């Protein structure tokens, strides 16, 4: 064939820390369908938000929002525990259907997104250029976030994993260091603050 319908930009959702996780890659031929399981960031999360995005940037915020919806009723469980199946399906007329289903509870929500939504030709052309120009920074952003999300989880298990020795003072002190590093944007400072936390958590 010399011509074909593709979806012109990557489509995905926003994941923990403000990142775009892609479900359908740009220039994928339509119709097409892909699913991916996600879970919860923290303990006892009963409600998740599915925020649909079109674009190539690693920062969710830099992509074109296509819509969103909530999925509630999830049994409050430990992080990583819920299995939220996310499905993106683009039919031959270009209509996008997005659904999220929590496997344990059976709770499902969905949204339908008109084919005309999203960025236009010139917009699409900018998006690709701006993504390739910023490839280096988006990648360092994506690492930052992976490092932050680890730091974050470490803060939450270290607080739960607290009679411990009368020395745990320096831990509560190393927690404040880490909580502060996680707010900045220097991947290495965050890991260093984690390293300091491991080294005073030996008695734990």
């Amino acid at each position: 064939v010399l011509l074909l319908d593709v979806t012109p930009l990557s489509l995905g959702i926003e994941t923990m820390g403000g990142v775009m996780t892609t479900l359908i890659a740009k220039n994928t031929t339509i119709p097409t369908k892909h699913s991916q399981v996600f879970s919860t960031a923290e303990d006892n999360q009963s409600a998740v938000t599915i925020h649909v995005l079109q674009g190539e940037r690693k920062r969710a915020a830099d992509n074109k929002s296509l819509g969103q919806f909530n999925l509630d009723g999830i049994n409050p469980a430990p992080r990583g525990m819920p299995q939220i199946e996310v499905t993106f399906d683009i039919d031959a007329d270009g209509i996008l259907h997005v659904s999220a289903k929590d496997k344990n509870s059976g709770k499902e929500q969905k949204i339908t997104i008109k084919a005309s939504s999203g960025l236009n030709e010139d917009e699409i052309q900018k998006m690709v250029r701006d993504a390739e120009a910023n490839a280096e920074a988006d990648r360092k952003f994506e690492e930052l976030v992976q490092t932050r999300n680890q730091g974050d989880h470490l803060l939450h298990s270290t607080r739960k994993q607290v009679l411990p020795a009368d020395d745990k003072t320096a831990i509560e002190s190393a927690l404040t260091a880490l909580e502060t590093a996680l707010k900045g944007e220097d991947k290495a400072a965050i890991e260093a603050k984690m390293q300091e936390l491991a080294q005073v958590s030996q008695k734990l």
């Binding site: 959702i13 926003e14 994941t15 923990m16 996780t21 991916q36 399981v37 996600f38 879970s39 919860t40 960031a41 923290e42 999360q45 409600a47 998740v48 938000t49 599915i50 925020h51 992080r79 990583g80 299995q83 939220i84 999300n149």
Partner: peptide, 8 residues
């Protein structure tokens, strides 16, 4: 391994 949705 599964990525995480935003949290509250």
């Amino acid at each position: 391994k599964p990525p995480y949705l935003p949290r509250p």
